Structures are given as C-alpha cells and as structure tokens.
Amino acid sequence: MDIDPYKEFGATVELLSFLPSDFFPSVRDLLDTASALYREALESPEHCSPHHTALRQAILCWGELMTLATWVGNNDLVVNYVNTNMGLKIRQLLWFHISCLTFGRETVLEYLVSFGVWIRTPPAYRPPNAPILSTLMDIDPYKEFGATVELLSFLPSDFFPSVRDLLDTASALYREALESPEHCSPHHTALRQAILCWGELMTLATWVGNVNYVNTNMGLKIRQLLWFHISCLTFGRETVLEYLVSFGVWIRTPPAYRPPNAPILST
Amino acid sequence: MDIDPYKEFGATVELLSFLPSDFFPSVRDLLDTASALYREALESPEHCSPHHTALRQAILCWGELMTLATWVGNNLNYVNTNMGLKIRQLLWFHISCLTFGRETVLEYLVSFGVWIRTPPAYRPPNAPILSTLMDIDPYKEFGATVELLSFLPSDFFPSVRDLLDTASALYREALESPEHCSPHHTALRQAILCWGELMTLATWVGNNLDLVVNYVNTNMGLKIRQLLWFHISCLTFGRETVLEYLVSFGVWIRTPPAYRPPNAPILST
Amino acid sequence: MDIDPYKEFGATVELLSFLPSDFFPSVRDLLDTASALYREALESPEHCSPHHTALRQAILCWGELMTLATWVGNNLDLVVNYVNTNMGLKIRQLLWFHISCLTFGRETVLEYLVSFGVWIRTPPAYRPPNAPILSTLMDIDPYKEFGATVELLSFLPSDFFPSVRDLLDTASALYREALESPEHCSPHHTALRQAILCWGELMTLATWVGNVNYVNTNMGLKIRQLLWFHISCLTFGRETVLEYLVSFGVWIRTPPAYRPPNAPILST
C-alpha cells in the first residue's frame, strides 16, 4: 500500500518536488509559526479543517523522531542523517499545511505552479525576486476524536495487535479509501499520516543498525493510533468511545472481583 | 486538573483571598453556626440547594483532617495555618450564601474588599457588615448510606490513583466548568480537593517526622475510594443503576459459590 | 496577573516577534509621524477609536519614562543604552502598531505581520531582496476623552490615593476576566491595560537603576491617579466619579473651620 501524504488536498508528492530542498524553513522556524497563529485551534477539542488534523499528526511525528534521534545519541552523526532524509519530509508537511491554513487551499496550489515556472527558466531570463506567499505546544492526538491519551492508558500494553499486523488490517479493509483523492472521514485524514509516520520511522530504525527498544516506546504509541482509527471506522465512531469507558471500569477493578474475560469490541 | 471549589457559584479563589486572612471566623464559630440553622437541612435526604451539597462535604472533609491531626500528634499546629484558612473560607462563604443569598455575598466580597484598600480617612467609618434587616451522611441525599456502600467488600473499590485519572479522562472538561451540571458534579468537585489537601498534609508529616501513608490508606483512603467510585459510576451509568448494582453485587458475594452465577455482576453500557 | 497589550486588538505579543528588533523606526521618527497625521484627533476629547485610547497612553508612557532616564543621568550615559534595549524597543512596537493600525486599518496590519513572517522564515537564497512593506489602505491629556482633566484631579491630595500594590490588587481581584479577555468592553479597560503595563516598565527600570525612592512621589503618583480613576469609572460608573470630582473640589478649596471634617465619600 502506497499512500500519498497530500493527495486529498489536491497536490502530489512530485508536484511539491518543484520546490528545491533548501527552500523550506527550519523546523524551529516552522513550529513557532504554527504555534503563533494556530495554538487555540490546534489544542481545540474539535477538528476545524482537514489541514488541522493533518498538521496535528505532523507535529507529533516530529516529536517521536526527535525523541528517537537523541536516544541513539546516548547509546553526534545521527542528527546529520535525520535532517537530510526524513527531517526534510517533515519540513514539507509542516510548510504545506501551515500555508494551507493561512493562504487558502488553492493559493498555495497555485504557488507551486507559480514557483514551478520560476525555478525552471534559465537564470538569464529570471526575475531576481522569487515568488512568495503574498497578502491573503503539547497537543493531544485523540483530542478532536473525543478520547484522550489518558483514556488509552487504561488499555494494557499487550491489548493492541502488532504494528505489522495492524498495517495489514488497514491495507486489506481500507485500501482504495486511503489511496483516494478524497477524505471521506476525519479518520482517514488522521490514519494516512500514521502510516507514513511509522514508515518514515522504520527507515531510521533500519539505518541506525548500520537494541530494538522502539517496539515498546514508539511502536506502542503507533499501535494506539492504528488501533483507534481502524476501530473508529470498523465498529462505528462512538461505539469505541463507549467501549474504552467499559474497559476502564473492567481494568480498574482488582482481581477476584472482575469477570476473567475482558470485554470484547463488537457490533 | 485544577478544580476551583467556588467556580460554579460565580466566585474565584482569588476573590475570596481579596479579603484579609484574619477576617474569617474560627471553625468552631462557623460549624456551630451551620448546626444552629441548617442541622435540620444538612441532614435531610434532599439537596434543596447546591450550597448544601457543597457544605456537607466541607464539614466532612474537616472531620477527616481532625481525625488525622489527632493521629499524627498521638503517634509521632500546621493545619490551622495552611489547611485551616482554606476550610474557614468554605464554611463562611456557603453559610452566607444560604443566609443572605448568593448574589448579596458576591457583591459583599467586592464592596468590603475595596474598603480595606481605601485609606482610612476617605472611606466609610464602619466596615459594611452584611445583614438583611451534628453528624451528616454524604450519600443520604443521593439514596445510599454508608452502610450500603460498606455492604460491598472493602477491597472491591480500585486504587486512588486509578480513580482520579478516570475523572480526568471522562469529565475533566466538566468538573472545571463554571456551572454545576449535576449534584453529583458538585459533590465530586469537593472530593478531589478533599483528597488533595489530605495528601498535602501527608507529605508534610512525611518530611517532618512511612507509617502515615500506611495509616491514611487504611481508614481515610478507603473512605475516599467509596464516594470516588460512587460518584464516577453515577455520572457514567446513572444514579438509578448504581443503587441496584450495590444490591445485586452485595447479595452475590454473600451466596455460596455453588448456587451463585459463575461470574461476578459488573456494570456496563 | 499577566496582562497583554495587543491581545485585545487581535495580535499577540509573540506574533509581533515575527518582526526583528531592528525593524521598527525610532521613537523620534514615530512621534513625528503621529503628530503630523493625528494631532487634531489625539488631543481631541473624543473616543474616536480604541487605537487612539491605546496610543494616547503609549505616548505618555514614553513621556514619563524619558523623564526618569533624564533624571538618573544627573544623580548617580550608562542608562540610555539600557532604556533603548529593554524599554524603547518594547515601546517602539506599541507605537509602530497603533500608528500603522490607524493608518492602514487594523486587518491589514494583521495580514502584514503574517506576510513579514513568510519573508523572514525563508532562507536568504530564495527570499526577495525587497521587504514586503505596506503602503495601501505635542501634549496629551490622558483623561480628556473621559470627561475629566489633569487639573481636575490635582485637587485630590497626595495622601488620598492608595498605594500602587493596593491598587493593582484591586484590579486583578475585581477585573481580571475582563482585562485579560480579547474584547474591549469599555474605553476604560483599554486605558487600564496600558497603565498597568507602563507600571511594569517603570518598576523594571527602577530595579536596574538600583543595580530612587522618588518614583512613587513624582511618577508613581501619576500612576496612582490613573489607576484610581479607571477603577472607579468601572466600579461606580463614569458619570458618578466625574460628579464626585467637582464635589471634592468645593470641599478641598474651602479653608478649615468652614468645611465638614468628613470628606464626601464615593457611594452607589
């Protein structure tokens, strides 16, 4: 399954390769621009726009890569690797969705065409001023979906399936829905990023070998985002919101006072 | 979470500390004031006001501090300085809401609060005093008693850390609301703050002279886990369902194991 | 109480950190712009815009700070570089904002601070060499728009106003959800956010000068009058305190053994 991270928004990954690599601002310069304008709209308990759901998973995915990169620095050079291969990818996702929130949807799509002809022409007949976008923070990933990360701390560590076992569930059930140019739900917008957040993390975990604590620290965090959004699409949206409450009272009761089988999720 | 126990009444905790610290009466003058006027109403099985639900837990939380302060003095002064000022304000504000109205005391904290602030030559000569001229049960207004909650086993109720974060994962945006959504919410806002100042005293004696945290969890931590489990379940499953759960589960643990249903009764949606 | 000067008008403090420090024109070149375009409206007794109420107090905040900087130059050159780095730069923003919001409208500045954000975030090999500058659409009485004058409040004696800490605690206890809110709700709240923040800069400078107890009898008294007048305008209404000020005038002007010994207290 090959998921284009911005295909629902009108762009492609190769149309956005019109811009050079060293055109996007730094992640320090992108996260502060996000928090200066959209702070109460990013910490909001509802999804105002499909860029807002896409930007929330992009900020949190950089939080995982920075937690992973400084981990292997303890156990100097990996920061030079992460800022060239996948740190550039987060800079594309942060730049695109910030400039979609500010300067509309179609204006930044017309900007990639208007930059696509500026960089293309020879330097003799090029204007000196490149085209630029003219006149018009700890977030919770489940916050617009109703649950919190505290509510999913009641589920034990072995309740979730494997991450390879969970990509196969989404790739079989919802493949032509996740690889579509539409959204069709705010869950598919959030689910498409968690595929690539794990996909752009496993290439770092493959490169760092040339030990595997990732499957209890970062992978357990991605097995929650995969399970919550698959079950939000399969067994309804609010049925899983009331299932976690019913699992909350089961896991809180001590042994010899609860039924021995955990409550399953169905219908 | 940070819960303000005046927030649903229109007042804030910094509007109450607008006044001087020594203005509020003693706990003995305030507890016998509420017993002289509302002992026939605080012991009643109805709410009749959201101030009565807040006042029943404010008296009971002071009884929990005066069962721990007697224990830490006996098994080796601080309460009246820190915890005593916070309990004198809850008794003063809730009595004066029931006696003089809720809106008059809110315009009294503003008017008297600027009266100290003005210089003593350009202010009115006298302070503008306000005049329009006991054993209680925390479940009795809800339907249960202490006896029905003790009918269930003592180690049935979960840990205190397991119950605080359930409220923070289900009703954090409703416990910190400026509106009392239910009398279960008003009785629950006091219980988080009662355990908050109960544990705050326990860390101070832990640094002063751990036996005390083993003592609190026996007879005070168990008493907190009762109404923390009770008010969370009554918000989730309804008050008319938890009362049947205590009856259903209470008979189930008493019957012999060969003639009971094989799994314990549990509440769910 | 952490009050914010721009949060009422739409922007924030950190959103104005998009622009660098050395972008704003000097305090000399900004006051020459204000007096050239808005002098018949800044000195007018009307409430013409909430930018005018914030600009009337921002000039007099600098007019009181420069007095303190001139005063410490005698009774000890090392303070001018301080008052141009921490203050100065903090008041160059508040003067640049309300002049440019009066001139080009308020919503154009908020789309300009974003548009200078994208010009400053891009690497220098791809941004244009031209900045995205915007070009398309004297003494001030601080009480005159509200009804009173300075000399009407000189009749109240120096031992009549409470201290600044007693008058700032009255603010955060009575009006804190209305001062910190992003709405105006009155011309008094807008004039009260600046008087609190101007005291934040005076006590900051007075601390570093002592690293000076005349501040609360030459400049703190002007803050004690401004904080008293706007708290009383919200507590008792505006007409009542203006009617009380003429009733203190006929009291404090009569000699002793002809006036009642009790001052005419504010009521209602």
Short mmCIF file of N, CA, C and O in Angstrom, two decimals, chain B residues 107-221:
data_model
loop_
_atom_site.label_atom_id
_atom_site.label_comp_id
_atom_site.label_asym_id
_atom_site.label_seq_id
_atom_site.Cartn_x
_atom_site.Cartn_y
_atom_site.Cartn_z
N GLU B 107 -21.64 40.51 45.94
CA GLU B 107 -21.47 41.96 45.98
C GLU B 107 -20.95 42.45 47.32
O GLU B 107 -20.68 43.64 47.46
N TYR B 108 -20.83 41.56 48.30
CA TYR B 108 -20.24 41.92 49.58
C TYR B 108 -18.73 41.75 49.59
O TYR B 108 -18.03 42.56 50.19
N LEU B 109 -18.24 40.70 48.93
CA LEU B 109 -16.80 40.49 48.83
C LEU B 109 -16.13 41.58 48.01
O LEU B 109 -14.96 41.90 48.25
N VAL B 110 -16.85 42.17 47.06
CA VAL B 110 -16.31 43.27 46.29
C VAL B 110 -16.34 44.57 47.09
O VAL B 110 -15.35 45.31 47.09
N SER B 111 -17.43 44.84 47.80
CA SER B 111 -17.58 46.12 48.48
C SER B 111 -16.71 46.18 49.73
O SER B 111 -16.09 47.21 50.01
N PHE B 112 -16.67 45.10 50.51
CA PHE B 112 -15.81 45.09 51.68
C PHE B 112 -14.35 44.97 51.29
O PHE B 112 -13.48 45.47 52.01
N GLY B 113 -14.06 44.35 50.15
CA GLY B 113 -12.68 44.17 49.74
C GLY B 113 -12.00 45.46 49.35
O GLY B 113 -10.80 45.61 49.58
N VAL B 114 -12.74 46.40 48.76
CA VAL B 114 -12.16 47.71 48.49
C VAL B 114 -12.19 48.61 49.71
O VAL B 114 -11.56 49.68 49.69
N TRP B 115 -12.89 48.21 50.77
CA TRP B 115 -12.99 49.07 51.95
C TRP B 115 -11.70 49.06 52.76
O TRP B 115 -11.33 50.08 53.33
N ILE B 116 -11.01 47.92 52.83
CA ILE B 116 -9.69 47.91 53.44
C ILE B 116 -8.70 48.65 52.56
O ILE B 116 -7.82 49.36 53.04
N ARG B 117 -8.88 48.54 51.24
CA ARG B 117 -7.93 49.10 50.29
C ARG B 117 -7.92 50.62 50.27
O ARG B 117 -6.86 51.21 50.07
N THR B 118 -9.07 51.25 50.49
CA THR B 118 -9.15 52.70 50.58
C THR B 118 -8.42 53.19 51.83
O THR B 118 -8.30 52.45 52.81
N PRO B 119 -7.90 54.42 51.81
CA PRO B 119 -7.25 54.95 53.01
C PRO B 119 -8.28 55.24 54.09
O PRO B 119 -9.45 55.51 53.78
N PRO B 120 -7.89 55.19 55.36
CA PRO B 120 -8.88 55.27 56.45
C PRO B 120 -9.44 56.66 56.71
O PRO B 120 -10.14 56.83 57.72
N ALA B 121 -9.18 57.65 55.87
CA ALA B 121 -9.77 58.97 56.03
C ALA B 121 -10.84 59.29 55.01
O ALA B 121 -11.67 60.17 55.26
N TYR B 122 -10.85 58.60 53.87
CA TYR B 122 -11.79 58.86 52.79
C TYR B 122 -12.69 57.67 52.53
O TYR B 122 -13.30 57.58 51.46
N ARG B 123 -12.79 56.76 53.49
CA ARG B 123 -13.63 55.58 53.45
C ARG B 123 -14.75 55.71 54.48
O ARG B 123 -14.69 56.58 55.35
N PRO B 124 -15.82 54.91 54.37
CA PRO B 124 -16.87 54.96 55.39
C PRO B 124 -16.33 54.52 56.73
O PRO B 124 -15.37 53.73 56.81
N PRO B 125 -16.90 55.03 57.83
CA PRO B 125 -16.23 54.87 59.13
C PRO B 125 -16.29 53.46 59.69
O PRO B 125 -15.36 53.05 60.39
N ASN B 126 -17.35 52.72 59.39
CA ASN B 126 -17.51 51.36 59.86
C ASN B 126 -17.47 50.38 58.69
O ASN B 126 -17.82 50.74 57.56
N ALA B 127 -17.01 49.17 58.96
CA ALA B 127 -16.94 48.15 57.93
C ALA B 127 -18.34 47.71 57.55
O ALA B 127 -19.17 47.48 58.44
N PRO B 128 -18.66 47.58 56.27
CA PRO B 128 -20.06 47.37 55.87
C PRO B 128 -20.49 45.92 56.06
O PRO B 128 -20.51 45.12 55.14
N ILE B 129 -20.85 45.58 57.31
CA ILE B 129 -21.23 44.22 57.65
C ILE B 129 -22.57 43.89 56.99
O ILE B 129 -23.36 44.78 56.64
N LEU B 130 -22.81 42.61 56.76
CA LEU B 130 -23.94 42.17 55.96
C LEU B 130 -25.04 41.63 56.87
O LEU B 130 -24.79 40.78 57.72
N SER B 131 -26.25 42.17 56.70
CA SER B 131 -27.42 41.73 57.45
C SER B 131 -28.66 42.20 56.73
O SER B 131 -28.89 43.41 56.61
N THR B 132 -29.48 41.26 56.26
CA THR B 132 -30.77 41.58 55.66
C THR B 132 -31.74 41.90 56.79
O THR B 132 -32.45 41.03 57.30
N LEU B 133 -31.76 43.17 57.19
CA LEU B 133 -32.56 43.60 58.33
C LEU B 133 -33.20 44.96 58.10
O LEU B 133 -32.51 45.93 57.77
N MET B 134 -23.52 17.69 65.28
CA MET B 134 -24.16 17.42 64.00
C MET B 134 -23.39 16.39 63.21
O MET B 134 -22.20 16.56 62.94
N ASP B 135 -24.07 15.31 62.82
CA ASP B 135 -23.46 14.24 62.04
C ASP B 135 -24.23 14.10 60.74
O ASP B 135 -25.45 13.90 60.75
N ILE B 136 -23.52 14.21 59.62
CA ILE B 136 -24.12 14.19 58.30
C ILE B 136 -23.64 12.96 57.54
O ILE B 136 -22.69 12.29 57.94
N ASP B 137 -24.31 12.68 56.43
CA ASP B 137 -24.11 11.45 55.67
C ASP B 137 -23.92 11.87 54.22
O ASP B 137 -24.81 12.52 53.64
N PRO B 138 -22.79 11.53 53.59
CA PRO B 138 -22.51 12.06 52.24
C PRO B 138 -23.33 11.42 51.14
O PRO B 138 -23.37 11.98 50.04
N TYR B 139 -24.00 10.29 51.39
CA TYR B 139 -24.81 9.66 50.37
C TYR B 139 -26.30 9.79 50.62
O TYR B 139 -27.08 9.38 49.75
N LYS B 140 -26.72 10.33 51.77
CA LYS B 140 -28.13 10.30 52.16
C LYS B 140 -28.99 11.15 51.24
O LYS B 140 -30.16 10.82 51.02
N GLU B 141 -28.43 12.21 50.67
CA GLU B 141 -29.16 12.98 49.68
C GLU B 141 -29.19 12.30 48.31
O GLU B 141 -29.94 12.75 47.44
N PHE B 142 -28.40 11.25 48.11
CA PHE B 142 -28.32 10.57 46.83
C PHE B 142 -29.08 9.26 46.80
O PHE B 142 -29.35 8.74 45.72
N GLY B 143 -29.44 8.71 47.96
CA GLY B 143 -30.20 7.48 48.04
C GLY B 143 -29.52 6.39 48.83
O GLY B 143 -30.21 5.60 49.48
N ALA B 144 -28.20 6.31 48.80
CA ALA B 144 -27.48 5.30 49.54
C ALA B 144 -27.13 5.82 50.92
O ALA B 144 -27.44 6.96 51.28
N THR B 145 -26.51 4.97 51.73
CA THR B 145 -25.95 5.37 53.01
C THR B 145 -24.49 4.96 53.07
O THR B 145 -23.92 4.54 52.06
N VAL B 146 -23.87 5.07 54.25
CA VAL B 146 -22.56 4.47 54.43
C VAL B 146 -22.68 2.96 54.53
O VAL B 146 -21.76 2.23 54.16
N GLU B 147 -23.82 2.47 55.02
CA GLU B 147 -23.99 1.04 55.26
C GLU B 147 -24.14 0.28 53.95
O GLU B 147 -23.63 -0.83 53.81
N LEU B 148 -24.83 0.87 52.97
CA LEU B 148 -24.99 0.21 51.68
C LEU B 148 -23.69 0.20 50.90
O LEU B 148 -23.44 -0.74 50.14
N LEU B 149 -22.86 1.22 51.07
CA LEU B 149 -21.56 1.23 50.41
C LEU B 149 -20.56 0.32 51.11
O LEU B 149 -19.64 -0.19 50.47
N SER B 150 -20.73 0.11 52.41
CA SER B 150 -19.91 -0.85 53.14
C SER B 150 -20.43 -2.27 53.01
O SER B 150 -19.78 -3.20 53.49
N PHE B 151 -21.59 -2.45 52.37
CA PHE B 151 -22.12 -3.78 52.11
C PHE B 151 -21.27 -4.50 51.07
O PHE B 151 -21.11 -5.73 51.13
N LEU B 152 -20.72 -3.75 50.13
CA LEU B 152 -19.75 -4.27 49.18
C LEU B 152 -18.42 -4.50 49.91
O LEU B 152 -18.20 -3.94 50.98
N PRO B 153 -17.54 -5.35 49.37
CA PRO B 153 -16.28 -5.62 50.07
C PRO B 153 -15.36 -4.41 50.08
O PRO B 153 -15.47 -3.49 49.26
N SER B 154 -14.43 -4.41 51.04
CA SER B 154 -13.56 -3.26 51.23
C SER B 154 -12.53 -3.15 50.13
O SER B 154 -12.20 -2.04 49.69
N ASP B 155 -12.00 -4.28 49.66
CA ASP B 155 -11.06 -4.28 48.55
C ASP B 155 -11.73 -4.51 47.21
O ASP B 155 -11.11 -5.10 46.32
N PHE B 156 -12.98 -4.09 47.06
CA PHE B 156 -13.59 -4.07 45.74
C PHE B 156 -13.27 -2.77 45.01
O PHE B 156 -13.10 -2.76 43.79
N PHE B 157 -13.21 -1.67 45.76
CA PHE B 157 -13.02 -0.37 45.15
C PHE B 157 -11.57 -0.21 44.68
O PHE B 157 -10.65 -0.67 45.36
N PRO B 158 -11.35 0.41 43.52
CA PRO B 158 -9.99 0.47 42.96
C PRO B 158 -9.04 1.37 43.72
O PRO B 158 -9.40 1.95 44.74
N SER B 159 -7.82 1.49 43.21
CA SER B 159 -6.83 2.36 43.84
C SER B 159 -7.21 3.82 43.62
O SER B 159 -7.98 4.16 42.73
N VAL B 160 -6.64 4.68 44.47
CA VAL B 160 -6.98 6.10 44.40
C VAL B 160 -6.37 6.73 43.17
O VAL B 160 -6.94 7.65 42.58
N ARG B 161 -5.20 6.25 42.75
CA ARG B 161 -4.61 6.72 41.50
C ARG B 161 -5.38 6.22 40.29
O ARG B 161 -5.35 6.85 39.23
N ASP B 162 -6.08 5.09 40.42
CA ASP B 162 -6.88 4.57 39.33
C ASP B 162 -8.20 5.30 39.17
O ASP B 162 -8.82 5.20 38.11
N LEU B 163 -8.65 6.01 40.20
CA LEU B 163 -9.94 6.67 40.15
C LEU B 163 -9.85 8.16 39.87
O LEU B 163 -10.81 8.73 39.36
N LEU B 164 -8.72 8.80 40.20
CA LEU B 164 -8.58 10.22 39.93
C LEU B 164 -8.43 10.48 38.44
O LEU B 164 -9.02 11.42 37.91
N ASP B 165 -7.67 9.64 37.75
CA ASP B 165 -7.46 9.83 36.32
C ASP B 165 -8.64 9.35 35.49
O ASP B 165 -8.68 9.63 34.29
N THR B 166 -9.58 8.62 36.08
CA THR B 166 -10.81 8.30 35.37
C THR B 166 -11.69 9.53 35.23
O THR B 166 -12.27 9.78 34.17
N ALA B 167 -11.76 10.35 36.29
CA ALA B 167 -12.47 11.62 36.20
C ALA B 167 -11.75 12.58 35.27
O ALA B 167 -12.39 13.33 34.52
N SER B 168 -10.42 12.55 35.27
CA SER B 168 -9.64 13.39 34.37
C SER B 168 -9.69 12.93 32.93
O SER B 168 -9.35 13.71 32.04
N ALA B 169 -10.09 11.68 32.67
CA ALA B 169 -10.23 11.20 31.31
C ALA B 169 -11.68 11.18 30.83
O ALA B 169 -11.92 10.91 29.65
N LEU B 170 -12.63 11.44 31.71
CA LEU B 170 -14.03 11.45 31.33
C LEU B 170 -14.72 12.79 31.56
O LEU B 170 -15.56 13.18 30.76
N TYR B 171 -14.40 13.49 32.65
CA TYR B 171 -15.12 14.71 32.99
C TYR B 171 -14.19 15.85 33.39
O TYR B 171 -14.57 16.68 34.21
N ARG B 172 -12.98 15.90 32.83
CA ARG B 172 -12.07 17.00 33.15
C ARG B 172 -12.60 18.32 32.62
O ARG B 172 -12.49 19.36 33.28
N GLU B 173 -13.21 18.30 31.44
CA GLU B 173 -13.81 19.49 30.85
C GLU B 173 -15.18 19.82 31.43
O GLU B 173 -15.78 20.81 31.01
N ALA B 174 -15.68 19.02 32.37
CA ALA B 174 -16.94 19.31 33.03
C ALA B 174 -16.82 19.52 34.52
O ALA B 174 -17.71 20.13 35.12
N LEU B 175 -15.76 19.01 35.15
CA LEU B 175 -15.53 19.32 36.56
C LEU B 175 -14.97 20.72 36.74
O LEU B 175 -15.27 21.37 37.75
N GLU B 176 -14.18 21.21 35.79
CA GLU B 176 -13.67 22.57 35.83
C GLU B 176 -14.59 23.56 35.12
O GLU B 176 -14.16 24.67 34.82
N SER B 177 -15.83 23.17 34.85
CA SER B 177 -16.78 24.08 34.25
C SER B 177 -17.25 25.11 35.27
O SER B 177 -17.26 24.83 36.47
N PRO B 178 -17.65 26.30 34.83
CA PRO B 178 -18.21 27.29 35.77
C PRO B 178 -19.68 27.08 36.07
O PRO B 178 -20.35 27.99 36.56
N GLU B 179 -20.21 25.89 35.78
CA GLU B 179 -21.60 25.57 36.02
C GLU B 179 -21.69 24.20 36.67
O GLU B 179 -21.09 23.24 36.18
N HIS B 180 -22.43 24.11 37.77
CA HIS B 180 -22.69 22.82 38.41
C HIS B 180 -23.71 22.08 37.54
O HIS B 180 -24.91 22.36 37.55
N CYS B 181 -23.20 21.12 36.77
CA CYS B 181 -24.05 20.39 35.84
C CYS B 181 -24.98 19.42 36.54
O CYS B 181 -26.03 19.08 35.99
N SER B 182 -24.62 18.97 37.74
CA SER B 182 -25.39 17.98 38.48
C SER B 182 -24.97 18.05 39.93
O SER B 182 -23.84 18.48 40.22
N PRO B 183 -25.83 17.64 40.87
CA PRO B 183 -25.37 17.49 42.26
C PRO B 183 -24.33 16.40 42.44
O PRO B 183 -23.63 16.41 43.46
N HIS B 184 -24.21 15.46 41.50
CA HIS B 184 -23.08 14.55 41.52
C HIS B 184 -21.79 15.28 41.19
O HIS B 184 -20.73 14.92 41.72
N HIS B 185 -21.85 16.30 40.34
CA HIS B 185 -20.65 17.04 39.99
C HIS B 185 -20.18 17.91 41.14
O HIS B 185 -18.97 18.03 41.38
N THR B 186 -21.12 18.52 41.87
CA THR B 186 -20.76 19.37 43.00
C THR B 186 -20.16 18.56 44.13
O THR B 186 -19.17 18.96 44.73
N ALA B 187 -20.73 17.38 44.40
CA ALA B 187 -20.17 16.50 45.42
C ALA B 187 -18.86 15.86 44.97
O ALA B 187 -18.10 15.38 45.82
N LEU B 188 -18.58 15.84 43.67
CA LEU B 188 -17.33 15.27 43.19
C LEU B 188 -16.21 16.30 43.13
O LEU B 188 -15.05 15.93 43.31
N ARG B 189 -16.54 17.57 42.89
CA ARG B 189 -15.52 18.62 42.91
C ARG B 189 -14.91 18.78 44.30
O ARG B 189 -13.73 19.11 44.42
N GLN B 190 -15.70 18.55 45.35
CA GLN B 190 -15.16 18.62 46.70
C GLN B 190 -14.29 17.42 47.03
O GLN B 190 -13.35 17.55 47.82
N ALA B 191 -14.57 16.26 46.44
CA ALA B 191 -13.85 15.05 46.81
C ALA B 191 -12.44 15.04 46.25
O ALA B 191 -11.53 14.49 46.88
N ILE B 192 -12.23 15.62 45.06
CA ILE B 192 -10.88 15.72 44.51
C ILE B 192 -10.05 16.69 45.33
O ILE B 192 -8.87 16.46 45.59
N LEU B 193 -10.66 17.80 45.75
CA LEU B 193 -9.96 18.78 46.57
C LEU B 193 -9.82 18.33 48.01
O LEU B 193 -8.90 18.79 48.69
N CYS B 194 -10.69 17.45 48.50
CA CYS B 194 -10.52 16.95 49.86
C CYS B 194 -9.35 15.99 49.94
O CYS B 194 -8.57 16.03 50.90
N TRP B 195 -9.19 15.13 48.93
CA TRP B 195 -8.03 14.25 48.89
C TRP B 195 -6.76 15.03 48.56
O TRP B 195 -5.67 14.60 48.95
N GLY B 196 -6.89 16.15 47.86
CA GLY B 196 -5.72 16.95 47.54
C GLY B 196 -5.09 17.58 48.77
O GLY B 196 -3.87 17.58 48.91
N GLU B 197 -5.91 18.12 49.67
CA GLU B 197 -5.38 18.65 50.92
C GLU B 197 -5.15 17.57 51.96
O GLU B 197 -4.47 17.82 52.96
N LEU B 198 -5.71 16.38 51.76
CA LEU B 198 -5.39 15.27 52.64
C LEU B 198 -4.01 14.71 52.34
O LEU B 198 -3.26 14.38 53.25
N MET B 199 -3.67 14.60 51.05
CA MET B 199 -2.34 14.13 50.70
C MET B 199 -1.29 15.20 50.92
O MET B 199 -0.12 14.86 51.16
N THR B 200 -1.67 16.48 50.85
CA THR B 200 -0.72 17.57 51.09
C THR B 200 -0.26 17.57 52.54
O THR B 200 0.92 17.80 52.83
N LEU B 201 -1.18 17.29 53.47
CA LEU B 201 -0.81 17.14 54.87
C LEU B 201 0.06 15.90 55.07
O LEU B 201 0.97 15.91 55.92
N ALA B 202 -0.17 14.85 54.28
CA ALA B 202 0.56 13.61 54.47
C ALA B 202 2.01 13.72 54.01
O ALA B 202 2.89 13.05 54.56
N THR B 203 2.29 14.55 53.00
CA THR B 203 3.68 14.74 52.60
C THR B 203 4.43 15.63 53.59
O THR B 203 5.64 15.48 53.74
N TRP B 204 3.73 16.55 54.26
CA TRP B 204 4.40 17.42 55.21
C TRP B 204 4.84 16.66 56.45
O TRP B 204 5.96 16.85 56.94
N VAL B 205 3.98 15.79 56.98
CA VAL B 205 4.36 14.97 58.11
C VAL B 205 5.36 13.90 57.69
O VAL B 205 6.17 13.43 58.50
N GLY B 206 5.38 13.53 56.40
CA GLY B 206 6.42 12.66 55.90
C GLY B 206 7.79 13.32 55.87
O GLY B 206 8.81 12.64 56.00
N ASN B 207 7.83 14.64 55.70
CA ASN B 207 9.08 15.37 55.81
C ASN B 207 9.36 15.83 57.24
O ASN B 207 10.50 16.18 57.54
N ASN B 208 8.35 15.84 58.10
CA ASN B 208 8.55 16.30 59.47
C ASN B 208 9.13 15.20 60.35
O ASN B 208 10.23 15.34 60.90
N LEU B 209 8.41 14.10 60.51
CA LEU B 209 8.86 13.01 61.36
C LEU B 209 8.88 11.69 60.61
O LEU B 209 9.27 10.66 61.16
N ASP B 210 7.20 4.76 55.71
CA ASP B 210 6.32 5.88 56.05
C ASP B 210 5.03 5.34 56.65
O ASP B 210 4.18 4.80 55.94
N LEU B 211 4.88 5.49 57.97
CA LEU B 211 3.73 4.92 58.66
C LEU B 211 2.45 5.69 58.35
O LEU B 211 1.37 5.09 58.30
N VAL B 212 2.56 7.00 58.11
CA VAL B 212 1.37 7.84 57.97
C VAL B 212 0.64 7.53 56.66
O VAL B 212 -0.60 7.43 56.65
N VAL B 213 1.37 7.29 55.57
CA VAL B 213 0.72 6.96 54.31
C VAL B 213 0.18 5.53 54.35
O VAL B 213 -0.74 5.20 53.59
N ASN B 214 0.70 4.69 55.24
CA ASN B 214 0.05 3.41 55.50
C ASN B 214 -1.17 3.59 56.38
O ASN B 214 -2.10 2.77 56.33
N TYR B 215 -1.19 4.65 57.19
CA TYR B 215 -2.35 4.91 58.04
C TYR B 215 -3.49 5.55 57.26
O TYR B 215 -4.66 5.24 57.52
N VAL B 216 -3.16 6.44 56.33
CA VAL B 216 -4.19 7.16 55.57
C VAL B 216 -4.95 6.20 54.66
O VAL B 216 -6.18 6.26 54.58
N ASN B 217 -4.25 5.27 54.03
CA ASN B 217 -4.90 4.35 53.10
C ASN B 217 -5.77 3.31 53.79
O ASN B 217 -6.60 2.68 53.13
N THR B 218 -5.61 3.13 55.10
CA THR B 218 -6.42 2.14 55.81
C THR B 218 -7.83 2.66 56.06
O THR B 218 -8.81 2.02 55.65
N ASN B 219 -7.96 3.80 56.73
CA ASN B 219 -9.27 4.28 57.15
C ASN B 219 -9.68 5.62 56.57
O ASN B 219 -10.83 6.01 56.73
N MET B 220 -8.77 6.34 55.91
CA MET B 220 -9.19 7.55 55.21
C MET B 220 -9.11 7.38 53.70
O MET B 220 -9.96 7.91 52.98
N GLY B 221 -8.11 6.65 53.22
CA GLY B 221 -8.04 6.36 51.80
C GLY B 221 -9.13 5.43 51.34
O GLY B 221 -9.60 5.53 50.20
#
